[PDB]
């Protein structure tokens, strides 16, 4: 585990932990998922936490979060996640689309932060992220 990987997990955690209290609640999870166009029920949110809630305190701490993400790591689930970003449906995630998703998530990005994110997944160097690229990234 590298230093940059930890900083990414730390930011991924911060995106959920809206009030920055060090834990992720079912409420925070729902807010994020709705902001990405999903609509989990209360039961589903509780189930998500329960699966990784080692200490049974009802909320997710940093390690439990890491476990959640490691368990997350078919075609349909990936396609769906692609469509969260590919808003116009043209088959390419642009920088403007990525920035739009991050902004709905309450995260403001500099053009450089966004470009850097595209750069990470863009394999062919067209400056966009196609489905295959998005699959190589997620897989």
């Amino acid at each position: 585990l590298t230093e940059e990987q930890i900083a990414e997990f730390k930011e991924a955690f911060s995106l959920f932990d809206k009030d920055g209290d060090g834990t992720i609640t079912t409420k925070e999870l729902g807010t994020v998922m709705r902001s990405l166009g999903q609509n989990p029920t209360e039961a589903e949110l509780q189930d998500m936490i329960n699966e990784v809630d080692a200490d049974g305190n009802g909320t997710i701490d940093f390690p439990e979060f890491l476990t959640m993400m490691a368990r997350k790591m078919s075609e349909e689930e990936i396609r769906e996640a692609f469509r969260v970003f590919d808003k116009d449906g043209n088959g390419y995630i642009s920088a403007a689309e990525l920035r739009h998703v991050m902004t709905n998530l309450g995260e403001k990005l500099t053009d450089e932060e966004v470009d850097e994110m595209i750069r990470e997944a863009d394999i062919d160097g067209d400056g966009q992220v196609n489905y295959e690229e998005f699959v190589q990234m997620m897989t």
Binding site: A7, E8, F9, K72, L98, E113
Partner: peptide
């Protein structure tokens, strides 16, 4: 906005999303 010790990853953001 750049935050020291923090880094925005597309990958982890993907998994974070469905």
């Amino acid at each position: 906005k750049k935050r020291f010790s923090f880094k925005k990853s597309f990958k982890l953001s993907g998994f974070s999303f469905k």
